[PDB]
Amino acid sequence: AAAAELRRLLPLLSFAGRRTGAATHSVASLIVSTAYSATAARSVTNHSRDCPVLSKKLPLPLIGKESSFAARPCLNCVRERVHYVSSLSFCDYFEKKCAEAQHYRNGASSNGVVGTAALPKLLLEAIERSYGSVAAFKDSVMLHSTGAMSPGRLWIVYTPPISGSEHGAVRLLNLPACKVPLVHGLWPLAVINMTEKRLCEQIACRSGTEEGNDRAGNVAQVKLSSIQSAIAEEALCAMNWKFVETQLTSALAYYSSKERTQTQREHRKEKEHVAAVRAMSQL
Amino acid sequence: VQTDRIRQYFKGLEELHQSRRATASSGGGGVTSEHKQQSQLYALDNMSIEMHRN
Amino acid sequence: DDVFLLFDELTALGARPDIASVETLHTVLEHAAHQPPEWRETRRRQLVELYQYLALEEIERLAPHRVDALLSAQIARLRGNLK
Amino acid sequence: LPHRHQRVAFDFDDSLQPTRAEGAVGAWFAGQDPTMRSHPDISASF
Amino acid sequence: MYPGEYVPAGHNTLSSLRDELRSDLTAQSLKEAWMRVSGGMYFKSIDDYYASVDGLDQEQLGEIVSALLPDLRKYEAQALVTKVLESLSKPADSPSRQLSRTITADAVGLDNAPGHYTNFLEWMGRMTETKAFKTEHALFEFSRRKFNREDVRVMFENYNLMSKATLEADSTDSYSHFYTVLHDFSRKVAGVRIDPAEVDPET
Amino acid sequence: MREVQDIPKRLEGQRSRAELTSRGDEDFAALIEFIQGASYDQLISGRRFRKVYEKLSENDDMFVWLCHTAMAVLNPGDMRSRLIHNHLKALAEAVASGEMTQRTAFRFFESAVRSPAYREIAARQLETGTATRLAGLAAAADVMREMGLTRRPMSSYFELYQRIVERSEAMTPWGFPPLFQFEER
Amino acid sequence: DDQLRLCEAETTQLRMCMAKGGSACERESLLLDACLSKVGHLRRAISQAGSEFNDWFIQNVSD
Amino acid sequence: EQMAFLDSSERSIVEGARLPFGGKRPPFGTTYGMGERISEIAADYAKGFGLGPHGHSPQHDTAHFNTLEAEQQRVKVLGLGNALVRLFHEKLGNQDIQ
Amino acid sequence: FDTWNEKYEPWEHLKRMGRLAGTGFYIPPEWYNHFRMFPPINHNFQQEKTLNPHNVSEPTQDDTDYLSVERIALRDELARKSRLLASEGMRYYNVFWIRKPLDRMERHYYELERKGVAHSVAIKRVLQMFYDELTVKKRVAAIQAEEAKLSGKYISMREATVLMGVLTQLQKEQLTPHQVTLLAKEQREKAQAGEAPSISYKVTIHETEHDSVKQLQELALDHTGKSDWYTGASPV
Amino acid sequence: RKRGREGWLFGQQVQLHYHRFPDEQLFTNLTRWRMGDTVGDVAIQQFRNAQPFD
Amino acid sequence: LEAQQQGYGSAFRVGSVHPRLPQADIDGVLQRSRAETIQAELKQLVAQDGFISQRGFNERLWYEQEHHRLRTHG
Amino acid sequence: FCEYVPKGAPTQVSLSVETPYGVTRAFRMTEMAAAAADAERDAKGFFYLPRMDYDVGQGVAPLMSRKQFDVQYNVFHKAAVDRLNAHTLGSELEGHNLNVVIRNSSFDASHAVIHAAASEHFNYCFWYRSLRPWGTAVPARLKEELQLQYSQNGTLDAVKEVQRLFTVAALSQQSAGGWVYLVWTGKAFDVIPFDHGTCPIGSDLIPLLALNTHESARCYDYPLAAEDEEGDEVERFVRNFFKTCNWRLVEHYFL
Amino acid sequence: FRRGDYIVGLVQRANTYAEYIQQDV
């Protein structure tokens, strides 16, 4: 449902580079173009005077609904509303590409012993390179499941630096409601759904079966640790690991690429230069 | 003496940042104008000649 | 502008400005120049009148004690400040 | 005053003198509380 | 080593300034970092610090932190200044926080502890900050007779100066007028003449 | 004569009655009679100050007794109990008004009829006999709230809390030599 | 029994033979007096520590 | 009850100071037992009875209600009111019912 | 010293007060009104009469250590090895209702004993029952260190130096609130817009050490300066 | 009867204890408890129950 | 004065605010939640958990560190 | 006879509508309920579920249902406690009232676990306090003060502005994973959007109203309207909360 | 209530003795 607002809103901001396309504007790159400076700069950027959100008039999600907002857009929060919605589509699509694309019968169709035990070898080559043993990573997710300040999605990301084909092969990372670790600089291999909405709908169904004889009952003995380990085990069992492998190959493809080192190598020459004329012109 | 080696020390630190303040501040509180007048001149506490017979 | 009214009253009631008391003003006049320049220029000339009087009153204090080092040290502060 | 192990007027709340027996008595309290380590009146050398 | 006396849990005594900066905001790691970064400035209370910076309001210090930390909002930004200032000194109180200490402690309500042990630990200490303590605290210093003749004059001129209307306005509390009649002495528990020249203007 | 005899004007007649109805806050009037020693009319008189000490320390004979029963009787039992708390309010009625000397009052509270098998029930919660005070001091301070001892409400909780902390410093803080536990020859 | 001053006997002895070379005892200004300034507080700490004791055992131990 | 439930013209207000003891409990050991019997008599008429909410007598040895004014703070935050009244009295507004 | 408190014994009062009020010519005091039916204990005798020290007759003042010497031996060995385990619930005051890990684990020690474990091994293991329990509790602390620090609303130590590194600058170098107002704006620029013979140029602005919110979005682009470097799949 | 209540160690008439109650040093530190003054104190942790040597 | 007795300072020839943003700590925060770093935190905890009798500076207890130099000398 | 009965069972005269299978099957449910008095005694912590004054057997009036109140009170909030009760022991913050454990644990990396749950503990606790089921009218002592500030010369937009200001404050909670408070900032009332794990107490302010934006606050009842209205049920939510608001409390803490 | 319980009055808001907060201002 996120496509509606983007094409409704990307005409506002010009600094994107692409817009009003069939998501030809890479909505990921939007989260990499609209970044920390969208939200983390809410105080300093000082939305242009007559900004409604700063006057606490128009909610940040519904700037687009107002047309007069297009007459004088709030510069940064536009990127914000662009940033957030873009992430929202991103997590969904990845959630879909990982779970609404889980139709691959990974084996035994089981919520059981598999967890992380039957998966492609390269990850097993990469997991044990980071997580010591595959069993350890099987329970570490449970900890990234149980432990979360705000209930959020657990992600998997790769960290480049060491070229010993070991570094950051897998790093689990849970995050708040709709932040995608792109902005942190981390290639999100796989995403886990531990969202608040997903859990509460799991609460009612497992709450009792009842046989319809005694009475309509309600339960409170459930501890969050179980249900939050119940889903995290189900999404680890029904996970689409080949799609993950596709990510890992592509994720490694970037950091292994010469052009990456090159695009960084072209950039400082581009950065150091523009900083030079500054010192020269001021004298 | 150990505990006292601490108390006698930390005052030695706080006296600095106090005495430093008079020289560091923008002409901050140094010798007080009432201190210049009333408490400067020789008395039993300040530079007094001998307070004992013999 | 309110501060340079205060300094006038306390001296009107009888108090004398001392060197540290004047550098208080100089610190306000130098840094807070967001006022139009003429308002500075009445102070930038009046603030000098203090120093020139302050130094004249400064030497008469250290006059008889035949101490030139402190005297040269006291005027040193007064010289840089008017620079 | 007569000392503890030689007294014939036992106080109201103080333990009266313990019994004397060989230490190997743990088995004789089979059916009692299987966590009772020792009875505070069974003494080895009293 | 006294029996029953033990080194605190995890408080590594054998630490030094030579050792690296501890990675935890605690009572001991901060004041240790305050030794290196700040030297030796160890104020008694927070407003002792403000006296050093010569009149800087908290919101002003709340400004500079908002720059160093763009993520926090304004009223989140000021909170940091209070913390670090209250960490290195005795964590202080305000008539707003003396209400804050109530709202958090009243919200939880009655505890499920065996004898409501916490609530008593709360309600007892609660009374100690009430005016009706500084008043009674003064009386104990009054009965112990630590004042001089100069104070009696000051207490007395506090009594003449209060109007009978204020008495019935204070006799309500049954403690408040004692705070006034003992105003100066309540604080004194905590903390060469130059005549005009009389010359003949004529001769 | 009344001060050396320690007796107020007894309820002789209708005059004396209304003499003792609207007395008011005796704690403050004494502090006014003394503080006025600095006016021109009179000089400060120790005999007037001495009058204050008793007006403040009427109920100290009682206040001293509570710091004992709470902070010196280890394992008093659950003072939250109406049974135990009533024992105190009854005895607190006796230390104040002087019906019973402190030492006798103490030996009542310690040997008050508390519980059947009281030693054994304690042996489960209490290992070394000692017990917690913030349950006791809760009830201890609660007595002089129930019994209208002082006009100032905080005087009760204070002089309890203030006597303890000063006593918390001397060696063997709590246990007293029973010869000197209270006023005695 | 705290005979504190290690500076003391230096005067008390070497003055007995102060005809050693020839002079008065001007070194004692450090030894007999200034060596107290390092401990003058410690002596005050002792007395009150001892005074609280003479006050203490009167409360319980004394007869 | 006189003050806020009646108009200022027709309400008799009894002052406290003019009362015999000032209207509050006298200090205990002072008044020959005159005041103590009053509050005692007062409490003897004001003590409760019957099975309360917790399930015991108000004078039970273990179950103690009104711990640190919990029931007092309970009513103080709930508010003895009615949504039905709150709506109606809003809709009536300034006008008098008459 | 023999009858030092017999005249003040409670019974001797209530015994005497019994026959006093019984005569009907002595209005009984308040206490005897109440202690009439709650009479004190029968067998609470002074040591001054029962000439035995161990006779702890008073039921309330009773002092005794029920902890078996073996248990005092056991719990001391577990405690002394690991301060954190000993001082779990007693760091400021003994808490009634929560259970102390020492207790819960000293319970495990008995089970390992009866399960065949020799003492020396049981102590090494049962202590680990804490160190694998504190593991997660201290691990999760590092897990929720990410969610907080990465969110940016929480300050680790490295940024805590800065605040005091600034706070020290205030009193060490007195800044008029006017000057402080600039230190707000002049630092916010370096904080927001900062970044890491005319000689070519210095070590200057093109490589600095300060961290800026600007630098963050650069550290999202892998130094490419383009929105599109992430080759992975994305909504289309 | 001549000696009276006495102690075997040095005739003391009270049992030796520097600290007895499990929450004494807490209660005297009440003001500093609610006000968070004693969050990380050591003297209230280290010597809460320090009792004299045997 | 700085010129009369303090005059011949400089015996030879007598006559920053840097702020540092939290999230910028990229690599440090990442690794420190893995076991390899946590087990290091916990093993250190094991070391500083035995009943330590010191409670204060063994150099302030000069009779201790001046013994610790003596072993260090040998 | 309320003490002996398990934590939730009913208490009344049996209508004999239950057969032997009706009873014995219930008895087990009473039996396994004893596991509470075991577990609660072994899981007893320094912090706890704060008891609700208004009885919540029926769901909070119009705002919430009882199904929605089982989740937050009995499942989530407890899980916000269990974290704190667990992590407080061992830390120097062991055994402290909330106002001490909040600030001391506030704003630091490692301690964030406490500041997460504790600052949430008070949060969920205050959301119970703010809800009086059928709603109460704002006392005049406030209806004058709210009127002074939040009507920019309007026709008594005292609460009317407050309502909207919340909806903008809640919609601004773009995460939909935070809290919303009407805090007294020492000078001015202003609703502040609060992220989960951070309360206004950590911000030193005096909170007055608590409003939950977490989905678990609305998850079961409110998005039903959203699935039929397609706009913002959260707007429909906020408009319904003030039919249950408690200005009576925010009067006490006003002074 | 309705049955039983300006600019000048505003100033007073901001027996024998309370007469002067009405009067003396």
Q: What is the 3-state secondary structure (H, E, C) of chain I?
A: CCCCCCCCCHHHHHHHHHHHHHCCCCCCCHHHHHCCCCCCCCCCCCCCCCCCCCCCCCCCCCCCCCCCHHHHHHHHHHHHHCHHHHCCCCCCCCCCCCCCHHHHHHHHHHHHHHCCCCHHHHHHHHHHHHHCHHHHHHHHHHHHHHHHHCCCCCCCHHHHHHHHHHHHHHHHCCCCHHHHHHHHHHHHHHHHCCCCCCCCCCCCCCCCCCCCHHHHHHCCCCCCCCCCCCCCCCCC
CA distances from G12 to G5, G9, L49 (A): 11, 5, 77
Contact A273, A132 (CB under 8 A): no
CA distances from L155 to E165, K19, L145 (A): 41, 49, 15
Residues 6-25 of M with CB under 8 A from H: none
Run of H or E residues at A224 = helix A224-237
Q: What is the DSSP letter of K21?
A: -
Nearest CA in chain I to A275: I206
Contact E145, F34 (CB under 8 A): no
Nearest CA in chain L to E101: L99
Residues 35-74 of I with CB under 8 A from J: 47-48, 63
Quote helix, strand, coil % in chain M, to nearest 5: 50, 0, 50
Per-residue 3-state assignment (H helix, E strand, C coil) for G12-60: HHHCCCCCCCCCCCCCHHHHHHHHHHCCHHHHHHHHHHHHHHHHHHHHH
Instruction: Give the position of tokens 């407003």.
Output: E47
Q: How far apart are CA C74 and CA C55, in angstroms?
A: 8
Joined together, the tokens standing for residue L217 give: 């606050």
Contact F110, F75 (CB under 8 A): no
Q: Name the minimum distance, in Å, from the CA of G19 to any CA of chain B.
A: 26
Q: What is the DSSP letter of D17?
A: P
Q: How far apart are CA E8 and CA E6, in angstroms?
A: 6
Contact L78, L124 (CB under 8 A): no
Nearest CA in chain A to E76: A43
A44:E70 CB<8 A: yes
Q: How far apart are CA J53 and CA L4, in angstroms?
A: 49
Contact L116, A149 (CB under 8 A): yes
Q: How far apart are the two ends of chain K, measured CA to CA in Å?
A: 50
Resolution in A: 3.9
Joined together, the tokens standing for residue F175 give: 């246990």
Phi-psi region of A223 (alpha: psi -120 to 50; beta: other; left: phi over 0): beta
User: What residues of E are in contact with residue I153 (Cβ under 8 Å)?
Assistant: 71-72, 76
E192:B14 CB<8 A: no
I62:F129 CB<8 A: yes
Q: What angle do CA G58, G60, G61 make, to 5 degrees?
A: 75
Q: After which residues is chain F broken (C to N over 2.5 A)?
A: 58
Q: β-strand D19-20 against D42-43: which pairing, if any?
A: parallel
Q: Name the minimum distance, in Å, from the CA of F183 to any CA of chain G.
A: 13
User: What residues of A are in contact with residue I215 (Cβ under 8 Å)?
Assistant: none
User: What residues of E are in contact with residue A43 (Cβ under 8 Å)?
Assistant: 66, 70, 72-74
Overall size of chain L counted in residues = 255
Run of H or E residues at A72 = none
C and B touch with 3+ CB pairs <8 Å, answer yes
Q: How far apart are CA L183 and CA F56, in angstroms?
A: 44
SS3 L193: strand
Q: Name the minimum distance, in Å, from the CA of E46 to any CA of chain F.
A: 26
Q: How was this structure determined?
A: cryo-EM
Q: How far apart are CA A140 and CA A158, in angstroms?
A: 16
Nearest CA in chain L to A227: L75
Nearest CA in chain I to E6: I83
Q: Which strands sit side by side in the sheet containing A171-174, from one edge to the other?
A: A171-174, A154-158, A187-192
> Is the sign of the CA dihedral L120, L121, L126, L131 positive or negative?
positive
Q: How far apart are the two ends of chain B, measured CA to CA in Å?
A: 35
Q: Name the minimum distance, in Å, from the CA of E161 to any CA of chain H.
A: 22
Backbone angles phi, psi at L33, to 5 degrees: -70, -20
User: Which neighbouring-strand residues pair with L183?
Assistant: L190, L207
User: What residues of E are in contact with residue J37 (Cβ under 8 Å)?
Assistant: 90-91
Contact I59, F114 (CB under 8 A): yes
B12 CB-contact burial (10 Å; exposed 0-12 / middle 13-18 / buried 19+)? exposed
Q: How far apart are CA F135 and CA F80, in angstroms?
A: 7
Q: Name the minimum distance, in Å, from the CA of G47 to any CA of chain F.
A: 16
Q: What is the DSSP letter of J3?
A: S
User: What residues of L are in contact with residue A74 (Cβ under 8 Å)?
Assistant: none
Backbone angles phi, psi at L195, to 5 degrees: -75, 145
* Alpha helices (runs of H) in chain B, residue ranges in sequence order: 2-24, 33-37
Contact L211, L241 (CB under 8 A): yes
SS3 A83: helix
Q: Quick one: which of A159, A158, A240 has its CA closest to A193?
A: A240
Q: After which residues is chain M broken (C to N over 2.5 A)?
A: 5, 14
Q: How far apart are CA H78 and CA H66, in angstroms?
A: 16
Residue type, E73: R
Q: Quick one: which of E18, E17, E38 has its CA closest to E87?
A: E38
User: What residues of M are in contact with residue H17 (Cβ under 8 Å)?
Assistant: none
Contact L70, L219 (CB under 8 A): no
F162/J contact by beta carbon, under 8 A: no
Contact L218, L233 (CB under 8 A): yes
Nearest CA in chain A to I216: A36
> Is the sign of the CA dihedral K24, K27, K28, K32 positive or negative?
positive
User: What residues of I are in contact with residue C31 (Cβ under 8 Å)?
Assistant: 176, 178-179
CA distances from I27 to H76, I15, I18, I23 (A): 45, 16, 11, 10
Q: Name the minimum distance, in Å, from the CA of B11 to any CA of chain C.
A: 27
Torsion of CA A79, A83, A84, A87, to 10 degrees: 170
H77/E contact by beta carbon, under 8 A: no
For residue E172, how many other CB atoms are within 10 A of its CB? 11
Q: At what angle do helices E46-53 and I157-172 cross, to 10 degrees?
A: 50
F60 CB-contact burial (10 Å; exposed 0-12 / middle 13-18 / buried 19+)? middle
K36:A184 CB<8 A: no
I and F touch with 3+ CB pairs <8 Å, answer yes
Q: Quote the distance between the C-alpha of residue I72 and its chain's center.
A: 24
